[PDB]
Design a binder for these strands. Structure first.
Ligand SMILES: [Mg+2]
Ligand SMILES: [Mg+2]
Ligand SMILES: [Mg+2]
Ligand SMILES: [Mg+2]
Ligand SMILES: [Mg+2]
Ligand SMILES: [Mg+2]
Lengths: 140, 126
RNA sequence: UUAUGCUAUCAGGUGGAUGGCUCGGCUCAAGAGCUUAUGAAGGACGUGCCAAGCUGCGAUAAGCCCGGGGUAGGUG
RNA sequence: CUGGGGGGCACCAACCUCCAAAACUAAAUACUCCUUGAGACCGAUAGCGAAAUAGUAGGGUGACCGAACGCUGAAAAGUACCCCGAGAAGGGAGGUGCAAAGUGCCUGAAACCUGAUAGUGAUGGAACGAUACGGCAUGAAAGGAUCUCUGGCAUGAAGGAAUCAUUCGCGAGGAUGUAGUACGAAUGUCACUGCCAGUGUCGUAUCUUACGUUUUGAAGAACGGGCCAGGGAGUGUAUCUUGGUGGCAAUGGCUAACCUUUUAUCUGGGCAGCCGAAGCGAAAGCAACAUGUGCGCAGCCUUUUGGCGAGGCACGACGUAU
RNA sequence: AGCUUGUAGUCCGUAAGGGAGACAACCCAGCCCGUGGUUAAGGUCCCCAAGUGUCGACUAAGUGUUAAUACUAAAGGGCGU
RNA sequence: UGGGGCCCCGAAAAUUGACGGGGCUCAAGUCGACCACCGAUACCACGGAGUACCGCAAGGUAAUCUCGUAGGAAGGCGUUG
RNA sequence: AAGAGCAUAAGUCAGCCUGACGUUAUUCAGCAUAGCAGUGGAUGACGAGACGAAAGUCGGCUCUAGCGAACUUUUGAGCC
């Protein structure tokens, strides 16, 4: 706190000089007082007691990266500019495994012709891709 | 401009903002146009809560050949379809390239206040 | 000439604050890093012309011999 | 060896991978008795306990605890000779030195003690003082000279009489007129004068039963302080949350260890990694509006009444869990 | 019971200044500094600023001379007036 | 005979003593009225400071701003480098 | 228990039945105003029924008491 603000105040913003003794003016040390006298604060902070669910090992689980069709469509010109994509006979041939994306979602609009190869496709993503005349290949 | 606005002015450090605020109030008195006084009171707000406008919002709301005052920074995210004039406080480089490719202009607040004395048709964005 | 006293200032005593100075302390960094039965570190006692303490030294006892550097004084 | 082990519960099968129960091995790293360098470090009650005759004096049977003490001057030039005194004490006179700085000797505060000066004082009542008026003492510098003192004239806000006359009342007195007059804080102006401001102490009038704290309540017969000087109390690392000011900005932001260091700075590299970008669900898993409608502030246009209306609010639609 | 526990308003706590003999919380008043003026509460014999004030009666006990109040005596009687 | 005002008896406590004290009797007491004056920092006037809000500034408005403990916020002074 | 409610009835008797049902959302009081479990009580929604010509009534016994978090074990349906 601002020490110079309190030169000549005695109590230094604490009230009586009987406050600020030690751990008993805080109710215990740490998150102490779980549900006897700090129960309401315990519930509001996000420290409620309980155990709920299980965990799978991290060896087997994976966290897929995603990209929506709108995002993939809008930045296609920049992708071919960087040499990532390819523009043979007009339709963009864009491969998602060189970027680092394992699944294509479907939020947004698609207007350009896209030939997208990847591992996974939501149903709506495939519907939107092929309603614009494009094609999707399950990359293996 | 009581002591309140003087305090809010004293907090600022960047000289260009201070010069803008003073000149905007002067020009507002000169032309009797509340637009400049409004922009001054906006620029005099907390710096945490300024405006950051993406290209998509301008494309969504404006029309062909509008004039725009953005007391903040224009960010480049989206696609710009039609020519627009966006006189803002600052542009990012991608935003500048997109607006130039579309065929618009990117002129600072000084240029817009000098060219148009009254703001007869300016649209404030946020 | 009102004594014993009270208040304020001045001169002096006692005292050792303040200021100025400081071969000391502390912290960080870069180096360097074992020694002793061929008797170590540490201790007791002694050792000076006048010498009590500390420092050095050991009955050859604030010391002896050789090689280099240094140059006119030396005797912690 | 046609063998054996492992692949996060046991066994079977496939696949992948290794060869224990013997042994050695530089460099990158840790530390500071010690040597060198540097310092937004302390400056003698501080900094190590020790500016070291300091682990000493001293204290304890012992394990062990543990202080205080810096400074003449440029040069000792460290007070010759004379008088007093019992004097190798000490004093006086007289010298040295820019200056006594006269030996633990730079400067030399306060408490405390001795003397002098001013006020007061042996008929007198107390939180030791604040305010106004007087006596006595001082008032050189740094404070005043249309300033100090005494008067005249002009304007004067709120307020505002005395005196006399008429009239009412049992009476104390009231009302009207004289009169909103004569005066009135102050504001200007013309003469007059040499003091005033300030400081000490005493007297008169009004007021006040100290200060910090605990207390519903303190002058308390509640606690603390004899006095003076010095010392003496919200600081750093990690992490979470939130303001004021900034850089960059979905083609996002920042680098960490380290290398280039030419001595700790600095310039340029360093994409490992962290946060943001998609959520829901215990999990398997699945995977959304890049605007469909309305009300409307600011601002702009306008017949000053309406219109457009970013942000804001309210809907509608969709992802997932149940 | 100056006791204990409730409730409405206002206060002390944290509230100067004026008046009550002194009075945490009772009456007037809620307060920046300086000067002039008129009033509030309360008072006007002296202490003490301003009435030995006016009109009509009562008391003879120094009764009384004490807004509220934790500080002020009752039943009963009197051919006292 | 009944209803009222004042007073008397009923009425005894320990240091000396409390209408605040002196004292007060057609009152300096009690009851019902009345007149004049005194008396705050209240209210009025003048000058000055600060604050709140507005205004580009100059400046403008304040009967509807000026108490304060725990405590929140803003601007300044000082010590060493 | 105490208080409140009830007459072609919320009381007495007879006939027929099991709504003393599975799942789920708000609002009220516990806990005026003004945060606080679990858990209860009033309106509803989905799926099945009983009685009755139908309207309707039925989420026990006219209304307000008869009860307990996390962790742990056991049991039921289906999944990870
Ligand atoms: Mg020391
Ligand atoms: Mg208290
Ligand atoms: Mg001190
Ligand atoms: Mg109060
Ligand atoms: Mg008072
Ligand atoms: Mg305070």
């Amino acid at each position: 706190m601002d020490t110079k603000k309190f030169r000549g105040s005695r109590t230094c913003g604490g009230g009586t000089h009987k406050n600020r003794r030690g751990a008993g003016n805080r109710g215990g040390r740490g998150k102490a007082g779980g549900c006897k006298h700090h129960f309401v604060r315990a519930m509001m902070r996000g420290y409620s007691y309980g155990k709920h669910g299980f965990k799978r090992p991290d060896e087997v689980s994976r966290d897929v990266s995603i990209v929506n069709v709108g995002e993939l469509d809008e930045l296609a010109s920049y992708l071919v500019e960087e040499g990532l994509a390819e523009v043979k006979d007009g339709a963009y041939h864009i491969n998602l495994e060189n970027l680092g994306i394992e699944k294509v979602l479907g939020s947004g609009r698609v207007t350009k012709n896209l030939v997208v190869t990847s591992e996974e496709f939501s149903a709506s993503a495939r519907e939107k891709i092929e309603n614009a005349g494009g094609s999707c290949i399950d990359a293996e | 401009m009581g002591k309140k606005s003087l305090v809010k002015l004293t907090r600022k450090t960047n000289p260009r903002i201070v010069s803008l605020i003073l000149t905007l109030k002067e020009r507002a008195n000169g032309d009797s146009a509340p637009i400049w006084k409004d922009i001054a009171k906006r620029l005099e707000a907390p710096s945490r809560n300024y405006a950051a406008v993406n290209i998509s919002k301008i494309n969504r709301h404006t029309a062909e050949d509008d004039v725009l005052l953005i007391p903040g920074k224009v960010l480049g995210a989206g696609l710009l379809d039609h020519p627009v004039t966006i006189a803002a406080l600052t542009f990012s480089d991608s935003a500048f390239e997109k607006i130039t490719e579309a065929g618009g202009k990117c002129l600072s607040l000084e240029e817009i206040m000098e060219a148009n004395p009254k703001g007869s048709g300016i649209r404030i964005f946020r």
